[PDB]
Write a protein that holds these residues in place. Sequence first.
Motif, PDB file in Angstrom:
ATOM      1  N   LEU A   1       0.802  -1.266  -0.096  1.00 37.12           N
ATOM      2  CA  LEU A   1       0.104  -0.111  -0.034  1.00 37.12           C
ATOM      3  C   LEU A   1       0.893   1.176   0.183  1.00 37.12           C
ATOM      4  O   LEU A   1       0.497   2.206  -0.830  1.00 37.12           O
ATOM      5  N   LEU A   2       1.881   1.351   0.770  1.00 35.09           N
ATOM      6  CA  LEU A   2       2.809   2.272   0.821  1.00 35.09           C
ATOM      7  C   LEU A   2       3.537   2.603  -0.512  1.00 35.09           C
ATOM      8  O   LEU A   2       3.266   3.748  -1.100  1.00 35.09           O
ATOM      9  N   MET A   3       4.030   1.586  -1.268  1.00 34.90           N
ATOM     10  CA  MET A   3       4.590   1.453  -2.535  1.00 34.90           C
ATOM     11  C   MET A   3       3.535   2.150  -3.358  1.00 34.90           C
ATOM     12  O   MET A   3       4.080   2.972  -4.563  1.00 34.90           O
ATOM     13  N   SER A   4       2.240   1.742  -3.429  1.00 32.57           N
ATOM     14  CA  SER A   4       1.512   2.145  -4.352  1.00 32.57           C
ATOM     15  C   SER A   4       0.849   3.317  -4.290  1.00 32.57           C
ATOM     16  O   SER A   4       0.690   4.001  -5.309  1.00 32.57           O
ATOM     17  N   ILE A   5       0.580   3.819  -3.159  1.00 29.84           N
ATOM     18  CA  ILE A   5      -0.155   5.128  -2.803  1.00 29.84           C
ATOM     19  C   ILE A   5       0.988   6.159  -3.122  1.00 29.84           C
ATOM     20  O   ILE A   5       0.561   7.261  -3.786  1.00 29.84           O
ATOM     21  N   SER A   6       2.186   5.944  -2.871  1.00 27.70           N
ATOM     22  CA  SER A   6       3.222   6.756  -3.069  1.00 27.70           C
ATOM     23  C   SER A   6       3.275   6.849  -4.715  1.00 27.70           C
ATOM     24  O   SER A   6       3.474   8.150  -5.348  1.00 27.70           O
ATOM     25  N   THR A   7       3.528   5.851  -5.460  1.00 26.65           N
ATOM     26  CA  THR A   7       3.578   5.935  -6.878  1.00 26.65           C
ATOM     27  C   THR A   7       2.460   6.722  -7.510  1.00 26.65           C
ATOM     28  O   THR A   7       2.665   7.453  -8.317  1.00 26.65           O
ATOM     29  N   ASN A   8       1.109   6.291  -7.079  1.00 23.76           N
ATOM     30  CA  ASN A   8       0.199   6.878  -7.766  1.00 23.76           C
ATOM     31  C   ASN A   8       0.268   8.511  -7.586  1.00 23.76           C
ATOM     32  O   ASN A   8      -0.201   9.272  -8.329  1.00 23.76           O
ATOM     33  N   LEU A   9       0.622   8.936  -6.362  1.00 17.72           N
ATOM     34  CA  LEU A   9       0.916  10.551  -6.007  1.00 17.72           C
ATOM     35  C   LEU A   9       2.024  11.119  -6.802  1.00 17.72           C
ATOM     36  O   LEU A   9       1.591  12.040  -7.343  1.00 17.72           O
ATOM     37  N   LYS A  10       3.045  10.353  -6.942  1.00 19.09           N
ATOM     38  CA  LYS A  10       4.156  11.039  -7.629  1.00 19.09           C
ATOM     39  C   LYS A  10       3.846  10.940  -8.996  1.00 19.09           C
ATOM     40  O   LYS A  10       4.079  11.998  -9.960  1.00 19.09           O
ATOM     41  N   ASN A  11       2.938  10.094  -9.602  1.00 13.59           N
ATOM     42  CA  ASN A  11       2.408  10.120 -10.924  1.00 13.59           C
ATOM     43  C   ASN A  11       1.582  11.235 -11.330  1.00 13.59           C
ATOM     44  O   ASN A  11       1.508  11.816 -12.377  1.00 13.59           O
TER      45      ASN A  11
ATOM     46  N   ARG B   1       3.856  19.571 -15.565  1.00 10.87           N
ATOM     47  CA  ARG B   1       4.435  19.092 -16.631  1.00 10.87           C
ATOM     48  C   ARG B   1       6.091  19.607 -16.385  1.00 10.87           C
ATOM     49  O   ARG B   1       7.067  18.877 -16.611  1.00 10.87           O
ATOM     50  N   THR B   2       6.013  20.564 -15.567  1.00 12.37           N
ATOM     51  CA  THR B   2       7.572  21.311 -15.280  1.00 12.37           C
ATOM     52  C   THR B   2       8.126  20.284 -14.297  1.00 12.37           C
ATOM     53  O   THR B   2       7.631  19.538 -13.652  1.00 12.37           O
ATOM     54  N   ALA B   3       9.515  20.179 -14.136  1.00  7.68           N
ATOM     55  CA  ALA B   3      10.010  19.170 -13.665  1.00  7.68           C
ATOM     56  C   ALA B   3      11.526  19.991 -12.794  1.00  7.68           C
ATOM     57  O   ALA B   3      12.426  19.260 -13.282  1.00  7.68           O
ATOM     58  N   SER B   4      11.528  20.735 -11.841  1.00  9.04           N
ATOM     59  CA  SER B   4      12.558  21.331 -11.173  1.00  9.04           C
ATOM     60  C   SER B   4      12.876  20.242 -10.409  1.00  9.04           C
ATOM     61  O   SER B   4      12.289  19.630  -9.797  1.00  9.04           O
ATOM     62  N   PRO B   5      14.422  20.181 -10.447  1.00 11.64           N
ATOM     63  CA  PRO B   5      15.081  19.268  -9.323  1.00 11.64           C
ATOM     64  C   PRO B   5      14.694  19.259  -7.913  1.00 11.64           C
ATOM     65  O   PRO B   5      14.887  18.365  -7.267  1.00 11.64           O
ATOM     66  N   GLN B   6      14.605  20.622  -7.710  1.00 14.57           N
ATOM     67  CA  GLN B   6      13.975  20.919  -6.379  1.00 14.57           C
ATOM     68  C   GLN B   6      12.417  20.478  -6.123  1.00 14.57           C
ATOM     69  O   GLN B   6      12.112  20.097  -5.234  1.00 14.57           O
ATOM     70  N   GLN B   7      11.767  20.589  -7.134  1.00 15.54           N
ATOM     71  CA  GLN B   7      10.249  20.327  -7.092  1.00 15.54           C
ATOM     72  C   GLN B   7       9.942  18.877  -6.945  1.00 15.54           C
ATOM     73  O   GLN B   7       8.908  18.472  -6.444  1.00 15.54           O
ATOM     74  N   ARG B   8      10.788  18.169  -7.751  1.00 20.38           N
ATOM     75  CA  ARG B   8      10.815  16.695  -7.886  1.00 20.38           C
ATOM     76  C   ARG B   8      11.236  16.182  -6.503  1.00 20.38           C
ATOM     77  O   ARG B   8      10.606  14.935  -6.240  1.00 20.38           O
ATOM     78  N   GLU B   9      11.976  16.890  -6.025  1.00 21.89           N
ATOM     79  CA  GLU B   9      12.256  16.375  -4.572  1.00 21.89           C
ATOM     80  C   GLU B   9      11.255  16.563  -3.679  1.00 21.89           C
ATOM     81  O   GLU B   9      10.947  15.644  -2.903  1.00 21.89           O
ATOM     82  N   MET B  10      10.360  17.765  -3.564  1.00 18.88           N
ATOM     83  CA  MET B  10       9.082  18.070  -3.051  1.00 18.88           C
ATOM     84  C   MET B  10       8.217  16.825  -3.357  1.00 18.88           C
ATOM     85  O   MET B  10       7.418  16.317  -2.617  1.00 18.88           O
ATOM     86  N   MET B  11       7.919  16.756  -4.830  1.00 17.67           N
ATOM     87  CA  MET B  11       6.980  15.524  -5.263  1.00 17.67           C
ATOM     88  C   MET B  11       7.299  14.254  -4.381  1.00 17.67           C
ATOM     89  O   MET B  11       6.273  13.692  -3.922  1.00 17.67           O
TER      90      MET B  11
END
Lengths: 271, 236
Positions: B109-119, B126-136
């Motif tokens: 559930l941890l793996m799945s919920i995380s993945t679904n949220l990251k996606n 659509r932007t992908a700042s190295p700082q923002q992807r860390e936030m994501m």
Amino acid sequence: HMLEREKIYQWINELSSPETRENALLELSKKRESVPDLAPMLWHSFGTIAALLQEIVNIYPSINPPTLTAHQSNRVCNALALLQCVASHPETRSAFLAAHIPLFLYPFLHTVSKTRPFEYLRLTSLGVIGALVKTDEQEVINFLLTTEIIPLCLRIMESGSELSKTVATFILQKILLDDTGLAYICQTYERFSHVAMILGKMVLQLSKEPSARLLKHVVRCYLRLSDNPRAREALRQCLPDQLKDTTFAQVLKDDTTTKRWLAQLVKNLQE
Amino acid sequence: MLEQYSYHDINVYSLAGLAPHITLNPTIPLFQAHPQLKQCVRQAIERAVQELVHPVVDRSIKIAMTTCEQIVRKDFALDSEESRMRIAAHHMMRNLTAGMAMITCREPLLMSISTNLKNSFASALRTASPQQREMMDQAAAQLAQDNCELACCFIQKTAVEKAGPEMDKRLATEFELRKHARQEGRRYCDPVVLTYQAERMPEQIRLKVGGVDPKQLAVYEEFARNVPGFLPTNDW
Ligand SMILES: N[C@@H](Cc1c[nH]c2ccccc12)C(=O)O
């Protein structure tokens, strides 16, 4: 001494109620070495095995996230200790297996937390499986092969304490010693490779931190693996150098059995 | 002590049961910067539960079934009544099924919920700042942790509800042994157990022929009172 036997009966009766169970667990686990017929009395009394399972399952909420305390661990390990006696006894072993009780222990074997409460939990749970395979029954091995016991053992052989590594490697050894076990582990290159890779890592570790008992079991595992022709071929090409040179010469001089096993291993790999 | 949900706090008839209990830590850096991304969270958790509940339910019942059948048949072998057996089996099966369900689903559930949220978060932005992807990644890991107990509970309860009738079906023959005997004017007693208990078991701990004494049923009552993951019940 009749007063002794009646104390035991009373404690057994006091396992059913959560009110009296913790103390009964404590007392019974202490006397399991002096009471030969403890195991059938536990198995065949009403609700007793059910209470021990209850103790196990009620620990599950403390596994993930890992919050298990020393107190919680000590208590369930007393329950686990009683199940070890049941697993060992020739009168209760088969019924213990038929009830698939080991499966409720595997969640404990899967934990990775390195705190003392969890390490003791894992070691005591291994001890139940250890008691099972020490009986050298084929039914035990076949059951274990139906389950995920082997990757559970391999993870512990990789990262566990010295004690846990030893019991887990012993379990693996018993499985390998069985003809079915050997064929299973050597059925695919992936299965064999994963086992060989873990033993290799262990051998390296052992060269830095000696352990006579762990080395013995590691060596026996390799020796048994070389009975399989495909494994023998692979081991010709990937046996740890530390098993071929004098790395373990000193520690092995006192260990004649392991020494003969290692020499037999080397001899097998030439043929 | 840390259980926050009672068994009735969660409706498992539909995935809509999850919605009121979702917890959104407002301090999450991804939420401070983008308060709108909170919208993506509900569907992510519902999807994670939706994809895991059936295999988790199936696996948990399968594992618990054999253990519960063997132990209950053993404990009640000299009990000619079906009712005591059926109730005890009900409580033990629901409990061990709930436990296996918790063990089976929490890490996935941890793996799945995380993945679904990251996606979801990567899709919405659509932007992908190295700082923002860390936030994501940070947000997704946090949200997963905070909602795993809820999701787990949903799946456990689904498993518990299905376990009962499956246990009834499994014990059909045991219920039939006792029914067949009674219609022959005799009480059912397992002959092997009858002999063993009489000959080998000390009187103080011997199974009683016929009914089981109420005090001895304590362990089975506890299975009912105390279900893992839920607040206990109150009055080459
Ligand atoms: N299902 C896995 C289990 C496993 C992992 N490593 C193993 C090593 C030996 C035997 C089985 C395993 C497999 O057979 O690959």
